[PDB]
Design a protein around this motif. Structure first.
Motif, PDB file in Angstrom:
ATOM      1  N   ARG A  64      -7.636   2.036  -8.556  1.00  9.50           N
ATOM      2  CA  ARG A  64      -6.608   2.330  -7.594  1.00  9.50           C
ATOM      3  C   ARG A  64      -5.319   1.575  -7.857  1.00  9.50           C
ATOM      4  NH1 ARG A  64      -7.208   5.135  -2.265  1.00  9.50           N
ATOM      5  NH2 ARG A  64      -8.796   6.652  -3.077  1.00  9.50           N
ATOM      6  N   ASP A  88      -3.843  -0.878  -6.605  1.00 13.13           N
ATOM      7  CA  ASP A  88      -3.147  -1.014  -5.364  1.00 13.13           C
ATOM      8  C   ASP A  88      -1.910  -1.901  -5.472  1.00 13.13           C
ATOM      9  OD1 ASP A  88      -5.003   0.409  -3.662  1.00 13.13           O
ATOM     10  OD2 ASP A  88      -6.377  -1.144  -4.376  1.00 13.13           O
ATOM     11  N   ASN A 103       1.867   0.042  -5.789  1.00 11.91           N
ATOM     12  CA  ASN A 103       2.022   1.051  -4.761  1.00 11.91           C
ATOM     13  C   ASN A 103       2.468   0.342  -3.494  1.00 11.91           C
ATOM     14  OD1 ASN A 103       1.793   2.947  -2.981  1.00 11.91           O
ATOM     15  ND2 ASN A 103      -0.425   3.305  -3.008  1.00 11.91           N
ATOM     16  N   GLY A 107       3.038   1.595  -0.895  1.00 10.48           N
ATOM     17  CA  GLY A 107       2.462   2.248   0.276  1.00 10.48           C
ATOM     18  C   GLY A 107       1.145   1.593   0.681  1.00 10.48           C
ATOM     19  N   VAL A 108       0.680   0.681  -0.154  1.00 14.90           N
ATOM     20  CA  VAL A 108      -0.564  -0.029   0.170  1.00 14.90           C
ATOM     21  C   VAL A 108      -0.205  -1.488   0.071  1.00 14.90           C
ATOM     22  CG1 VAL A 108      -2.909  -0.652  -0.367  1.00 14.90           C
ATOM     23  CG2 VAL A 108      -2.249   1.648  -0.613  1.00 14.90           C
ATOM     24  N   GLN A 142      -1.912  -3.694   2.051  1.00 13.18           N
ATOM     25  CA  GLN A 142      -3.099  -4.408   2.472  1.00 13.18           C
ATOM     26  C   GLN A 142      -4.228  -3.385   2.653  1.00 13.18           C
ATOM     27  OE1 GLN A 142      -4.764  -3.788   5.666  1.00 13.18           O
ATOM     28  NE2 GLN A 142      -3.219  -2.233   6.148  1.00 13.18           N
ATOM     29  N   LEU A 143      -5.469  -3.870   2.791  1.00 11.78           N
ATOM     30  CA  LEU A 143      -6.617  -3.013   3.078  1.00 11.78           C
ATOM     31  C   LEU A 143      -7.522  -3.930   3.874  1.00 11.78           C
ATOM     32  CD1 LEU A 143      -7.064  -1.338  -0.451  1.00 11.78           C
ATOM     33  CD2 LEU A 143      -6.526  -0.116   1.627  1.00 11.78           C
ATOM     34  N   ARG A 179      -7.043  -5.636   6.378  1.00 13.15           N
ATOM     35  CA  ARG A 179      -6.485  -6.864   6.933  1.00 13.15           C
ATOM     36  C   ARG A 179      -6.342  -6.779   8.474  1.00 13.15           C
ATOM     37  NH1 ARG A 179      -1.124  -8.905   4.047  1.00 13.15           N
ATOM     38  NH2 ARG A 179      -0.058  -7.056   5.070  1.00 13.15           N
ATOM     39  N   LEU A 180      -6.601  -7.857   9.204  1.00 12.30           N
ATOM     40  CA  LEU A 180      -6.544  -7.884  10.663  1.00 12.30           C
ATOM     41  C   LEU A 180      -5.116  -8.024  11.156  1.00 12.30           C
ATOM     42  CD1 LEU A 180      -9.396 -10.521  11.416  1.00 12.30           C
ATOM     43  CD2 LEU A 180      -9.508  -8.069  11.546  1.00 12.30           C
ATOM     44  N   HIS A 230      -7.206  -9.376  -4.182  1.00  5.69           N
ATOM     45  CA  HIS A 230      -8.411  -8.670  -3.730  1.00  5.69           C
ATOM     46  C   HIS A 230      -9.409  -9.757  -3.325  1.00  5.69           C
ATOM     47  CE1 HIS A 230      -7.981  -4.395  -4.474  1.00  5.69           C
ATOM     48  NE2 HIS A 230      -7.355  -4.710  -5.567  1.00  5.69           N
ATOM     49  N   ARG A 234      11.023   5.092   1.412  1.00  9.60           N
ATOM     50  CA  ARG A 234       9.690   4.848   0.896  1.00  9.60           C
ATOM     51  C   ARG A 234       9.393   3.340   0.903  1.00  9.60           C
ATOM     52  NH1 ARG A 234       7.861   8.731  -3.779  1.00  9.60           N
ATOM     53  NH2 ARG A 234       6.310   9.129  -2.143  1.00  9.60           N
ATOM     54  N   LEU A 245      10.478   1.449   3.428  1.00  8.47           N
ATOM     55  CA  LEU A 245      10.542   0.984   4.813  1.00  8.47           C
ATOM     56  C   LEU A 245       9.228   0.339   5.295  1.00  8.47           C
ATOM     57  CD1 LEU A 245      11.791   0.529   7.554  1.00  8.47           C
ATOM     58  CD2 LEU A 245      11.610   2.992   8.024  1.00  8.47           C
ATOM     59  N   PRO A 246       8.109   0.965   4.981  1.00  5.33           N
ATOM     60  CA  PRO A 246       6.838   0.384   5.445  1.00  5.33           C
ATOM     61  C   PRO A 246       6.583  -1.039   4.941  1.00  5.33           C
ATOM     62  CG  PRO A 246       6.538   2.643   4.816  1.00  5.33           C
ATOM     63  CD  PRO A 246       7.976   2.331   4.416  1.00  5.33           C
ATOM     64  N   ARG A 291       1.556  -1.477  13.467  1.00  8.68           N
ATOM     65  CA  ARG A 291       0.740  -1.010  12.389  1.00  8.68           C
ATOM     66  C   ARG A 291       0.827   0.479  12.191  1.00  8.68           C
ATOM     67  NH1 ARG A 291      -4.546  -4.012  11.705  1.00  8.68           N
ATOM     68  NH2 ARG A 291      -3.450  -4.434   9.623  1.00  8.68           N
ATOM     69  N   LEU A 295       3.842   1.921  12.667  1.00  7.57           N
ATOM     70  CA  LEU A 295       5.218   2.242  12.317  1.00  7.57           C
ATOM     71  C   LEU A 295       5.345   3.040  10.985  1.00  7.57           C
ATOM     72  CD1 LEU A 295       8.165   2.193  12.513  1.00  7.57           C
ATOM     73  CD2 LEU A 295       8.208  -0.270  12.100  1.00  7.57           C
ATOM     74  N   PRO A 296       4.626   2.626   9.948  1.00 10.61           N
ATOM     75  CA  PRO A 296       4.719   3.342   8.675  1.00 10.61           C
ATOM     76  C   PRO A 296       4.379   4.830   8.759  1.00 10.61           C
ATOM     77  CG  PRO A 296       3.511   1.255   8.327  1.00 10.61           C
ATOM     78  CD  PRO A 296       3.853   1.349   9.818  1.00 10.61           C
ATOM     79  N   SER A 355       7.000   6.480  10.691  1.00 11.72           N
ATOM     80  CA  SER A 355       8.235   6.509   9.952  1.00 11.72           C
ATOM     81  C   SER A 355       8.350   7.696   8.953  1.00 11.72           C
ATOM     82  CB  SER A 355       8.522   5.116   9.407  1.00 11.72           C
ATOM     83  OG  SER A 355       8.265   5.082   8.054  1.00 11.72           O
ATOM     84  N   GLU A 356       7.231   7.952   8.255  1.00  9.33           N
ATOM     85  CA  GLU A 356       7.218   9.067   7.287  1.00  9.33           C
ATOM     86  C   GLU A 356       7.428  10.420   7.933  1.00  9.33           C
ATOM     87  OE1 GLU A 356       3.852   9.138   4.584  1.00  9.33           O
ATOM     88  OE2 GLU A 356       4.671   7.136   3.912  1.00  9.33           O
ATOM     89  N   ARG A 391     -12.935   5.434  -0.504  1.00 10.21           N
ATOM     90  CA  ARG A 391     -11.914   4.757   0.281  1.00 10.21           C
ATOM     91  C   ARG A 391     -11.642   5.348   1.644  1.00 10.21           C
ATOM     92  NH1 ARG A 391      -7.347   1.582  -2.452  1.00 10.21           N
ATOM     93  NH2 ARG A 391      -8.656   0.442  -3.954  1.00 10.21           N
ATOM     94  N   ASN A 395      -7.309   5.612   7.771  1.00 11.23           N
ATOM     95  CA  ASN A 395      -6.394   4.486   7.475  1.00 11.23           C
ATOM     96  C   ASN A 395      -4.929   4.933   7.567  1.00 11.23           C
ATOM     97  OD1 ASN A 395      -4.991   2.320   6.427  1.00 11.23           O
ATOM     98  ND2 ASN A 395      -5.952   2.301   4.426  1.00 11.23           N
ATOM     99  N   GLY A 428      -2.564   3.258   7.123  1.00  9.79           N
ATOM    100  CA  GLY A 428      -1.810   2.510   6.104  1.00  9.79           C
ATOM    101  C   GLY A 428      -1.668   3.367   4.828  1.00  9.79           C
ATOM    102  N   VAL A 429      -2.512   4.391   4.755  1.00 14.27           N
ATOM    103  CA  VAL A 429      -2.464   5.333   3.596  1.00 14.27           C
ATOM    104  C   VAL A 429      -2.199   6.758   4.139  1.00 14.27           C
ATOM    105  CG1 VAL A 429      -3.766   6.340   1.637  1.00 14.27           C
ATOM    106  CG2 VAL A 429      -3.747   3.906   2.095  1.00 14.27           C
ATOM    107  N   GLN A 481      -0.493   8.828   2.078  1.00 19.36           N
ATOM    108  CA  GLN A 481      -0.332   9.649   0.891  1.00 19.36           C
ATOM    109  C   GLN A 481      -0.651   8.847  -0.320  1.00 19.36           C
ATOM    110  OE1 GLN A 481       2.023   9.042  -1.953  1.00 19.36           O
ATOM    111  NE2 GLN A 481       2.859   7.266  -0.824  1.00 19.36           N
TER     112      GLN A 481
END
Ligand SMILES: *[C@@H]1C[C@@H](O)[C@@H](O)[C@@H](CO)O1
Ligand SMILES: *[C@@H]1C[C@@H](O)[C@@H](O)[C@@H](CO)O1
Ligand SMILES: [Mg+2]
Ligand SMILES: [Mg+2]
Ligand SMILES: [Mg+2]
Ligand SMILES: [Mg+2]
Ligand SMILES: [Mg+2]
Ligand SMILES: [Mg+2]
Ligand SMILES: [Mg+2]
Ligand SMILES: [Mg+2]
Ligand code: NA
Ligand code: NA
Ligand code: NA
Ligand code: NA
Ligand code: NA
Ligand code: NA
Lengths: 1011, 204, 193
Positions: A1, A3, A6, A8-9, A11-12, A14-15, A139, A419, A421-422, B21, B23-24, B27-28, C1, C6, C8-9, C11
């Motif tokens: 992956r 990660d 990217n 766009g990722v 974290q995974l 994460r609290l 990771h 792209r 912004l996140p 969390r 927002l992303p 946002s898209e 995955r 999620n 957070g993903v 795309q």
């Protein structure tokens, strides 16, 4: 992956982010901020192995320890353990710019830890691990199984390991990537390092727990009443028997307490938050928090059942204070601030970017001792303890998101792109979520040097929307964009405009009044303190005091980012960019501090201390008027000491207690000033001393000072007829003068004093010659590179004009005898490429008293660049232990950096007359000197001087202080005039016109005699 | 043109939109719309979505738009129809003369709404005159108010066409079905039929 | 995955959004808004099979047509073809509220298409696929290799297929999830299809 390529990722697994928790299970422990049995540190000895890329990491590593690994301390930056080199680059990214990709060769740090976990942590509740800082992405696996991933090297990443742990021994594996898409948002001008560099801990929370809490303090019009509002959220099963109690303590006294079951008010058509509740406590006459008096209360939040059983408790320190911008002024508790700030990186010369409490405390104390009241977290959220210390010691803090993309072209290429912004939003939102309860944080910053993009505008509003209590600032894109509540430029000058296209840096005075502008202006960076710098610092301070909307600034910066390296013999030395084989690099540009890496001050710090004083003084006759610049406290730990001296000799002094209200004035009448018996200038010095020790200073601490000339009685007393008359001996090649056991020799072809003897002892190693140049300062150099010359920098102008190559040509050398003296007259021209740059005319008059009077008149061509200095120099044969002078001091001072120095009689060991800047240059000058003593020699006049074992030639030829070597004898440079040092910035000429030697014709006179 | 964001079923309605969390993802849905549709002259106003309460994600997104495309106003009705995330007061079902003072998100009479202390925005209902079944009673009262008050600039009737679907009987004859007719449950029965026209476009 | 649980993903490997393109190679055509030979439609008859959950999809399907699939028209909503029921709920979510999770029984529509690509498209330039609307999330593979993922049922999802195609026949496979974390943001008062 992949990660880590990217955006766009980020974290995974994460609290959510939240304020500092400890899950105490006893309220009093929470009250007292004592250690919690539910918060364990995993810091200490871990296993570590370095790999060139993630692809090279053996799969075996997940299940068990690699034999090849080593045992190292965590937290750490692996570069500081020698695994790879740290890199110092300022703007240019350390990796090819090709977002969001990173190099295939990506240094990977494999850390692991085998540790125990008690079954009581597992039989109930939640066990999470918290990584306060991982640079730059990682990771995590636990007992061989994959947990999650995280980015943002400056905020904690937390993960629930509840289901992955087992009672007994357990093994964590963390693979840390040096580079990731996160690096594109981490282009700060500092060393590029990596690793697990901040704390690692385990926190146990009950299943039914406090998951977030926010504290607000609102006030009435005169601050005599406040409302403490605490919003609390929970996770777990809601039950009607649940309760939250929030109690407020002032020391051991319980000030207020409120209890409620969960269930907030209706918010919209679907209702309200059944999992939250807001408690409101009234507080009468709250003790207010400020940097002046950091009054704090303690808020304890208990989650419990109706029957009184405690489930857990969280807590924080609370500072009652309001920050708002009104009518163009930044007010704190309704009074306009004057920010005496500094930017401060988390830098340790031995540990890299790992911070510890002792270093933090040391910094805070030195800061406070030096009249600073604010700090900017350049340019990322800091280690959590930092905020606790600022809250308690008292410093105003600007908390800044870890976002800097300076290396992009143009600067806002990523920040204007949705792209990104996140990723950017997490850097801002998670900082707010973590630090919003700290009273020391007064302003939020959206990051640094990332241009101005629409993502900044979106995040600016997010903040304003979730936390109206603190203004938002951001410098990018021109310093006065729609994403900033404060005009906060970097290196805008006081009076001089720098009209760059698109992002001009206006004079601060003019910026305030541009059409339509109404905001306050506080520089996010100014007075670049690189090397021998801080020239013109007083100019800023005078403007800040005169203009209400000019509310201060953050000097750039606190501490040199030099790192320790060891030579062959194992001795340490201070290293900068390129010194680790890193390239490209920005060499010394990482050393811009007021203090050296080890916290020893640079001379500039004292100038900062004086200009940032909190008491202003004026003198009128016997009257001294003291005005307080404190907004909240009375001078209850201060006394005024005064002393009157004649040319250094004390005539009288005394003390008076200071009793001035904030913003008030106190008049102090001095007693009749008994005339003095001798010619000379009387000088009055006053100092403010704090008799009692405080949390940040020792008893006797001097917090402010000022001097004034009082009466002067000029000497009209005619000497006294010498006992003898010097004799002149003329020969083909020399004019010699003999007087008693002293002899002077003037060479007729060179036209200089080539030798002087005391008895048969020679006193010179090099003749006495004029000098018009100086070993270039960092500010003189600018960005000029031998590989890429900046023709506009002072050093380049001087080179190109031939200043460093010009040779003296004799125009005249004569000798005459007078009734009681011998007179030598000389004239020399300094030329280059057939142009006359300078003409020096002198007379040396040696009399029966043995004094040699030197008169110097110099002409400087109008079209040559103004010279660095106009003086004489020589290498004395002897070396003496002390230097004694009547002039400005005691520390190094220059024309544009001498306000802090005092006129008096000083006496220091010779080495104190040399300032060990890491990158050597002209240094150690003292100005306003009327008398200089060294060995048996004395020089009298009104000059500037420096004296040391190093020639200017050596200093200019040497790049690191550790390589300098004491020459024979002592190099003395005595200047009639010296150019200012500048420092408004260090990459463009910054010496103000009034400090350039542009007069064309200069005169100075000195007397050299024996003592 | 309105972003594909509606979280009506949350409790409270802004639970996700006020959560950073989320927002992303939100946002898209707003940025990708603007990127695709910003050159169409027919689009005159951007909307941040529908019935998702009022959360800070809305305020950030409202600003982003204001920033990237100053050419068109931004509206959003969630959280009371007049929050800081809307350039236009855009209530749904606010009545002409009658107030409906619900707590937190009251629906004021439109005439009265315009003049609340400090208010100065135009008012355009995002939804009004619910055309479900035999309806549109009181339609003329809106129009009379829109013409007399400058700042009452109209509205969007709810809605154009019934969301009925065709099913076939035992004989193969088609029939109009609504909520629950597909064995779907729970369902909201005929509530999906609120238009001025039948699903085949025959006018009501 | 389980990217569909999620937020957070949203795309993976999707191209930037942009105004309507057609890459005309003749300007007069662009002036008059005439059809562009560079913008081709893949609408028409596709292969489709329905499964109760993503876990039930066979690996064979990535490389080869499932014999049980039927041939159906695309674009379409699978409920309209009778494979499962469309649901009409106004406010209450059609799935349990437990973000960002969705039910394990999650209707999955496996669509595929075998289609031709002329070499001229592959010799130079970029060939991208554009899905103007897929409800609610999906994974895409081309000639058996995974290309990317996408959410937001009402905007186009675009992927660069340049390195995945070959002259002549090619096969796409699209696994479409009925429910996803994007569903939490799609609670409109309308039929859920
Ligand atoms: C402002 C930003 C900071 O990080 C440094 O780069 C400084 C110059 O040394 O300018
Ligand atoms: C406004 C929102 C729209 O989607 C429908 O729910 C309407 C009532 O049918 O209200
Ligand atoms: Mg990433
Ligand atoms: Mg920078
Ligand atoms: Mg002074
Ligand atoms: Mg029902
Ligand atoms: Mg998803
Ligand atoms: Mg054609
Ligand atoms: Mg083929
Ligand atoms: Mg709805
Ligand atoms: Na001021
Ligand atoms: Na620097
Ligand atoms: Na006092
Ligand atoms: Na040097
Ligand atoms: Na009207
Ligand atoms: Na409806």
């Amino acid at each position: 992956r992949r990660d880590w390529e990217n955006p766009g990722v980020t974290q995974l697994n994460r609290l959510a982010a939240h304020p500092p928790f400890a899950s105490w299970r006893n309220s009093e422990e929470a009250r007292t901020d004592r250690p919690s049995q539910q918060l364990r540190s995993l810091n200490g000895e871990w296993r570590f192995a370095w790999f060139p890329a993630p692809e090279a990491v053996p799969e075996s590593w997940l299940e068990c320890d690699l034999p090849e690994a080593d045992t190292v301390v965590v937290p750490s930056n692996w570069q500081m353990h020698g695994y790879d080199a740290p890199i110092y680059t300022n703007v240019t990214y350390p990796i090819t710019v090709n977002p969001p990709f990173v190099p295939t060769e990506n240094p990977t740090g494999c850390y692991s830890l085998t540790f125990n976990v008690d079954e009581s942590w597992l039989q109930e509740g939640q066990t999470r691990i918290i990584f306060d800082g991982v640079n730059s992405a990682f990771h995590l696996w636990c007992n061989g199984r994959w947990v999650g991933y995280g980015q943002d090297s400056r905020l904690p990443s937390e993960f629930d390991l509840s289901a992955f742990l087992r009672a007994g021994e357990n093994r964590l594996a963390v693979m840390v990537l040096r580079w990731s898409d996160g690096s594109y948002l981490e282009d700060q001008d500092m060393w590029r390092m990596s690793g697990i560099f901040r704390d690692v801990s385990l926190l146990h929370k009950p299943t039914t727990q406090i998951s977030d809490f926010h504290v607000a303090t609102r006030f009435n019009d005169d601050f005599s009443r406040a409302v403490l509002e605490a919003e609390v959220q929970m996770c777990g099963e809601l039950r009607d028997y649940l309760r939250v109690t929030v109690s407020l303590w002032q020391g051991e006294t319980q000030v207020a307490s409120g209890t409620a079951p969960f269930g907030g008010e209706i918010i919209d058509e679907r209702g309200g938050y059944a999992d939250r509740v807001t408690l409101r406590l009234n507080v009468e006459n709250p003790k207010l928090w400020s940097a002046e008096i950091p009054n704090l209360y303690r808020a304890v939040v208990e989650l419990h059942t109706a029957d009184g059983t405690l489930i857990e408790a969280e807590a924080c320190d609370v500072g009652f204070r309001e920050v708002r911008i009104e009518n163009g002024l930044l007010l704190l508790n309704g009074k306009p601030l004057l920010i005496r700030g500094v930017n401060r990186h988390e830098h340790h010369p031995l540990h890299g970017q790992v911070m510890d409490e002792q270093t933090m405390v040391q910094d805070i104390l030195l800061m406070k001792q030096n009249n600073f009241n604010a700090v900017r977290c350049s340019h990322y959220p800091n280690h959590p303890l930092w905020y606790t210390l600022c809250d308690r010691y008292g410093l105003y803090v600007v908390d800044e998101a870890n976002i800097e993309t300076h290396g992009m072209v143009p600067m806002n290429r990523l920040t204007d792109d949705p792209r990104w912004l996140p990723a950017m939003s997490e850097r801002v939102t998670r900082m707010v979520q973590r630090d919003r309860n700290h009273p020391s944080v007064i302003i939020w910053s959206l990051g640094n040097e990332s241009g101005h993009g629409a993502n900044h505008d979106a995040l600016y509003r997010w903040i304003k929307s979730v936390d109206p209590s603190r203004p938002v600032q951001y410098e990018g894109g021109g310093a006065d964009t729609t994403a900033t509540d404060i005009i906060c430029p970097m290196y805008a000058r006081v009076d001089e405009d720098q009209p760059f296209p698109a992002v001009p840096k206006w004079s601060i005075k003019k910026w305030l009044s541009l059409p339509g502008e109404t905001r306050p202006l506080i520089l996010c960076e100014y007075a670049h303190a690189m090397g021998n710098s801080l020239g013109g610092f007083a100019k800023y301070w005078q403007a800040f005091r005169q203009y209400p909307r000019l509310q201060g600034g953050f000097v750039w910066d606190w501490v040199d980012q030099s790192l320790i390296k060891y030579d062959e013999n194992g001795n340490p030395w201070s290293a900068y960019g390129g010194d680790f084989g890193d390239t490209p690099n920005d060499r010394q540009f990482c050393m811009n501090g007021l203090v050296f890496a080890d916290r020893t001050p640079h001379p500039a710090l004292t100038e900062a201390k004086h200009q940032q004083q909190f008491f202003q003084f004026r003198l009128s006759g016997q009257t001294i008027e003291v005005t307080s610049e404190y907004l909240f406290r009375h001078s209850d730990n201060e006394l005024l000491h005064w002393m009157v001296a004649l040319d250094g000799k004390p005539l009288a002094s005394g003390e008076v207690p200071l009793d001035v209200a904030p913003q008030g004035k106190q008049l102090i009448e001095l007693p009749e000033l008994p005339q003095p018996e001798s010619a000379g200038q009387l000088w009055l010095t006053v100092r403010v001393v704090q008799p009692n020790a405080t949390a940040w200073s020792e008893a006797g601490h001097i917090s402010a000072w000022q001097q004034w000339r009082l009466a002067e009685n000029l000497s009209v007393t005619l000497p006294a007829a010498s006992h003898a008359i010097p004799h002149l001996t003329t020969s083909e090649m020399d004019f010699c003068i003999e007087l008693g056991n002293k002899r002077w020799q003037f060479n007729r072809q060179s036209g200089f004093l080539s030798q002087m003897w005391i008895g048969d002892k020679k006193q010179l190693l090099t003749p006495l010659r004029d000098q018009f140049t100086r070993a270039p300062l960092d500010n003189d150099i600018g960005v000029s590179e031998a590989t890429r010359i900046d023709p506009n920098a002072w050093v380049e102008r001087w080179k190109a004009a031939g200043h460093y190559q010009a040779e003296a040509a004799l125009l005249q050398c004569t000798a005459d005898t007078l009734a009681d003296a011998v007179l030598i007259t000389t004239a020399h021209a300094w030329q280059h490429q057939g142009k006359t740059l300078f003409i020096s005319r002198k007379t040396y008059r040696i009399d029966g008293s043995g004094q040699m009077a030197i008169t110097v008149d110099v002409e400087v061509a109008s079209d040559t660049p103004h010279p660095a200095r106009i003086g004489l120099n020589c290498q004395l044969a002897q070396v003496a232990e002390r230097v004694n002078w009547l002039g400005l001091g005691p520390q190094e001072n220059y024309p544009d950096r001498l306000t802090a120095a005092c006129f008096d009689r000083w006496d220091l060991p010779l080495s104190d007359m040399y300032t060990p800047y890491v990158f050597p240059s002209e240094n150690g000058l003292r100005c306003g000197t009327r008398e200089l003593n060294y060995g048996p020699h004395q020089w009298r006049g009104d000059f500037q001087f420096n004296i040391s074992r190093y020639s200017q030639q050596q200093l200019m030829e040497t790049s690191h202080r550790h390589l300098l070597h004491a020459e024979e004898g002592t190099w003395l440079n005595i200047d009639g005039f010296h150019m200012g040092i500048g420092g408004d910035d260090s990459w463009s000429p910054s010496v103000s016109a009034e400090f350039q030697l542009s007069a064309g014709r200069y005169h100075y006179q000195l007397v050299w005699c024996q003592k």
